[PDB]
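User: what does the whole thing look like in 3D?
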Amino acid sequence: SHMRVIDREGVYEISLSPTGVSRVCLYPGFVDVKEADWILEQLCQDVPWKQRTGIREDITYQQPRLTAWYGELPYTYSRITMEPNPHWHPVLRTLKNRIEENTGHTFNSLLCNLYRNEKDSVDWHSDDEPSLGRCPIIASLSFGATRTFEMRKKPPYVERVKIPLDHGTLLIMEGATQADWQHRVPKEYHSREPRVNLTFRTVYP
Amino acid sequence: SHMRVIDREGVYEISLSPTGVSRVCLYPGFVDVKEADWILEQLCQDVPWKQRTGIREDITYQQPRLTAWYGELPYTYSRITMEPNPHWHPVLRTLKNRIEENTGHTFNSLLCNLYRNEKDSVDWHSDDEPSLGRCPIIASLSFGATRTFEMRKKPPYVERVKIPLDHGTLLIMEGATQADWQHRVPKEYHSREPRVNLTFRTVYP
Ligand SMILES: O=C(O)CCC(=O)C(=O)O
Ligand SMILES: O=C(O)CCC(=O)C(=O)O
Ligand SMILES: [Fe+3]
Ligand SMILES: [Fe+3]
Ligand SMILES: [Fe+3]
Ligand SMILES: [Fe+3]
Ligand SMILES: [Fe+3]
Ligand SMILES: [Fe+3]
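Assistant: Here's the predicted 3D structure for the full assembly of 410 residues, as structure tokens:
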């Protein structure tokens, strides 16, 4: 099979070309369940979730998910639409610090994603906004219902990877992953409770 | 013993506090011996080595080692003294690309170090120049004679680490290593042939 499903702790080199190594690292249980329960409640209630207008392939649409931003915002993104808050919620500051102290990598930008139910999603894309630089390090922490993080390798051989992201799981993407792969979170065809995802990035001048 | 000697391939978390995880990764034989022989000759001959004036604890001195720079230069360093070349030597461009494609991390600055014999050295320091940011990723590739990379943990328990860096070995430092540790290359008391070290960094605005 040209497809792999990964739900185990580990470091995975999913491809070595054409750009270089694409690496994803999975840490299930990074936040234990009872603390993850409490974090989910606080973020659900306190983050200023909005359904925002997006563009993809130069055309404007309402995203099928709620979002909010903290810290730095990727430079080609609209400040007026995305409303990034320079004041981090204390739970989000704690989680930022925990991820940084444990992974050794720093971040200055946070996109909060809320998938309200199975009809919410994000379509195929790469995190290749240019103010992220070449080969960015991106950390993803999930709470709430499990949803699937799908990956597909771009054309010029396992060429598809699926990662269920369950409650308290940390995912890191680094290396050539954004140059050589796309990812999405598909809609589901059975009921899903809400999911909150936190995606931490570094935005540069 | 409060001291560890490391010469084996691996990922090492040498401390977890006070700042976060300090991680060093060692890859002996990153360049195979015959290619490493040829690279050593070309760099020895072609890099414009100079004995440059340094400062440490606000006082000026001639460094007991030869150096040259390529690409970006850490912002508090003098351009006139360090003479960074924006045009990379083709061997150095190849090695930069190889390190990036294999590690997944990018670099924009290179300090070349030549330890002429056992009397050359670099004293205790951290790579904590502020334009490197918090918790920089630094890659080190060595050629020629083996010399020892010593590390000592800063005071507020293995608190000392020694890493022999032999011909073709790649060393990566990341995480809290520069905040929480210092490192040096000591003089030796037996003959040493020359050693070339390449230290790749990312300098930010
Ligand atoms: O919800 C997720 O896990 C993925 C979100 C994502 O790819 C993004 O925000 O860029
Ligand atoms: O020669 C070495 O391996 C170490 C050099 C070093 O620490 C530096 O250039 O900052
Ligand atoms: Fe597991
Ligand atoms: Fe790749
Ligand atoms: Fe994404
Ligand atoms: Fe080994
Ligand atoms: Fe540490
Ligand atoms: Fe150093």
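In plain terms: The domain at 1-205 of chain B is CATH 2.60.120.590 (Jelly Rolls). DSSP finds four helices and 13 strands in chain B.
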